[PDB]
Amino acid sequence: SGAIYVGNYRVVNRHLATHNDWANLVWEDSSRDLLVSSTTAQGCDTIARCDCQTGVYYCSSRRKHYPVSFSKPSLIFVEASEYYPARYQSHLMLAVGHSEPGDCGGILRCQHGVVGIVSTGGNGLVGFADVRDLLWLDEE
Numbered sequence: 490s491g492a493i494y495v496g497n498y499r500v501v502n503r504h505l506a507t508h509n510d511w512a513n514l515v516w517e518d519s520s521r522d523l524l525v526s527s528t529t530a531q532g533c534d535t536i537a538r539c540d541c542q543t544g545v546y547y548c549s550s551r552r553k554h555y556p557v558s559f560s561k562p563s564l565i566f567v568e569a570s571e572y573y574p575a576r577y578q579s580h581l582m583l584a585v586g587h588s589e590p591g592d593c594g595g596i597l598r599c600q601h602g603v604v605g606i607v608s609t610g611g612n613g614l615v616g617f618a619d620v621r622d623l624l625w626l627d628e629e
């Protein structure tokens with residue numbers, strides 16, 4: 490579990506979105522596994538606007554932050570997980586690290602703020618769902 494809290498927006502894994510998230514929907518994309526909902530209180534997070542390929546992500550299934558190199562956001566094939574089938578997922582970055590289903594929503598950060606959240610795992614990779622292209626997270 491986990492969420493990016495930027496202005497009056499909450500960014501979660503679409504597959505973990507709550508009834509409240511859907512009741513206060515701003516934007517969703519199943520192909521990216523992202524959903525954005527509106528918040529009453531403002532958020533403590535800043536979004537990275539950058540082409541960084543090195544950062545630190547939180548792994549809940551290890552209680553640990555791990556420094557990682559990660560690929561640029563691409564359309565990638567992703568093997569069947571407990572929360573999705575084997576399928577293509579867009580705007581996805583892969584690093585070499587540990588990711589179990591429960592790890593989804595853990596933050597990846599670089600020197601520029603929040604890059605994205607955990608979304609995929611298995612075979613010793615961790616996929617992150619980039620949010621740097623979502624320019625509208627920083628307005629309105």
Ligand SMILES: Cc1ccc(CC(=O)NC[C@@H]2CCCO2)cc1
Pocket residue numbers: 516622623624625626
């Ligand atoms: C490349 C790219 C893709 C998607 C977005 C999402 C966004 O923030 N757009 C607000 C939504 C979209 C439909 C109407 O309102 C930004 C940039």
Ligand SMILES: [Zn+2]
Pocket residue numbers: 537538539540541599600601602
């Ligand atoms: Zn950066």
